[PDB]
């Protein structure tokens, strides 16, 4: 009985840990995805500036 319980508990812990591990790093994934556009505009700043430095 102890073996059956431990096997089932470890099996459940497998996917619960998988889902958690996705959960923490979804934040970083979306953060980088947004930083793409953030830096795009932060660098378009001086593009616009140098356009009229002409």
């Amino acid at each position: 009985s102890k073996r059956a319980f431990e096997l089932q508990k470890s099996a459940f812990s497998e996917e619960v840990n998988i889902k958690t591990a996705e959960a923490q790093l979804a934040y970083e994934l979306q953060g980088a995805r947004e930083q793409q556009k953030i830096r795009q505009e932060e660098i378009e700043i001086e593009v616009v500036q140098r356009k009229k430095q002409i």
Binding site: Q36, R39, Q40, I43, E44, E46, V47, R50, K51, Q53, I54
Partner: protein
């Protein structure tokens, strides 16, 4: 990749900025110096001939 793909546009504006600035700071001073040399040489010839 986004950073570099916009730094290329920064340099695309920089090439024309360098065009204008280099023209102003090199070509026009060269023309002015050539005119100055022409006029001073003409004056020196005019003085030397009649002396």
């Amino acid at each position: 990749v986004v950073e570099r793909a916009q730094q290329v546009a920064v340099q695309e504006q920089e090439i024309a900025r360098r065009e204008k600035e280099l023209e102003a700071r090199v070509r026009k001073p060269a023309e002015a110096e050539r005119y100055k040399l022409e006029r001073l040489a003409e004056a020196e010839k005019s003085q030397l001939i009649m002396q």
